[PDB]
Amino acid sequence: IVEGSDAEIGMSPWQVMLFRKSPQELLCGASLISDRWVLTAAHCLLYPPWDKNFTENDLLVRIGKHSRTNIEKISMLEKIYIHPRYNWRENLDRDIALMKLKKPVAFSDYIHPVCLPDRETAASLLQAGYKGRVTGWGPLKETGQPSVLQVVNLPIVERPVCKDSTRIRITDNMFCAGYKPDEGKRGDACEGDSGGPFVMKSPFNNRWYQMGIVSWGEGCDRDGKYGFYTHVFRLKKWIQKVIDQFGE
Amino acid sequence: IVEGSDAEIGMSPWQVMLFRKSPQELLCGASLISDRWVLTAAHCLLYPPWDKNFTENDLLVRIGKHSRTNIEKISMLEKIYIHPRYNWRENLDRDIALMKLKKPVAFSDYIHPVCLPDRETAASLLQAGYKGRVTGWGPLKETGQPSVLQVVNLPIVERPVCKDSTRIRITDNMFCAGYKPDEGKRGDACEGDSGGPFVMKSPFNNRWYQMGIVSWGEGCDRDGKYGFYTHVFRLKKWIQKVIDQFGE
């Protein structure tokens, strides 16, 4: 997270960290959506251009970690589900994956799931200018390593401007966010923040909803550039299918 | 309430009915703002143009009543406090009064206080077009008597339009609400709804706040006319003074 600030204790209890099991390596961010399911970006698990193709036994997730310098839960994975139409070949379309924990995790003051949006919440809040919040353990830029979870609030950007900022073919399964040059504020996700949640607080019921997943961007906090996020609601049917049918 | 609908059970647990003790006569609406304080319009208690000047022993309040056709609490009053600058002579400016219950009332699924606005809530929600909700036992028009509490949602109206709708000198201690001719929806408070609450639900904390008190209007649900409400936040300092200093 670039140009963000230290998160308050328990501010993001759905925050999950994805690690290579051994040797230890922080790979990406992720989020808790139930006692046994974690949501992340598919490219955090499968990305051939990088010779990356992790299987369940290669990873571990940490839940409840506020800083570096117990109360922290380390869980193994039982199964990984990558969206069948995730496109790592071209533009990271449908960059989403679900990971089922071997055992359900116990909730606490520091561990609690985030909600997934319904049609009404997505229609109401996915609007240009409306701010979401991104959290992560990514570096503090592109050279800068945090010992406390970082947080930054960023506004959703109109689609024509998102399209404009890149040569990549963007799709309706992505949205972009960040401040414009001259809006006078900065901030962006970066590297290891990948896979982490973009959340918004509903004015209807006061609950936090995960509207996006840190997916890609070009550079970190560069003027005229915006971070792209996986549009969670657009892929809700697949998410629901996996969680509803499996999870035994 | 004209052009409204039946309230759901427990939808307005802060609703209070002001009655002449004996013989029984429904006089006005009111609201519960704590276990021992009820808020209403001063004209419900003191209004010389009508030879009205009630004292504590002349009244009773009912709390928790959803319909006509126990669970209902009937309370006596210990003291009445009318704003010292309430102007019954000209335009009902500062039409507000507080009534202290002889004994504190027990809260239940049907009895619960409403919040009073702070500066931030008033600044955010008192905007033209933003809708509030009015509830009451007033007739169904100006000829029509409800056996179930009625409710209607109405939008706040821009001040120049409020000014325009009447010959009376309005003040900043009042705001008006209701639909415009051609907005295609109707609704208004009427008669006995007087003194009742105009509430709004905060998108910040999900709590209901009482922004106004049904004060006056000309006619009921007439095209081109709007109901005027006492601006509760504008008179917060006096309200707070009374509640903070007294209430023994």
Binding site: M11, Y110, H112, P113, M200, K201, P203 | -
Partner: peptide, 30 residues
């Protein structure tokens, strides 16, 4: 699930975090 999105140390204790108001204001501001 049913208690999703309500934080034990914030919403559940009626406490606001330092910047959540910034988000909500962006939704209601005209």
């Amino acid at each position: 699930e049913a208690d999703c999105g309500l934080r034990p140390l914030f919403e559940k204790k009626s406490l606001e975090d330092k910047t959540e108001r910034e988000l909500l204001e962006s939704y209601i501001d005209g």
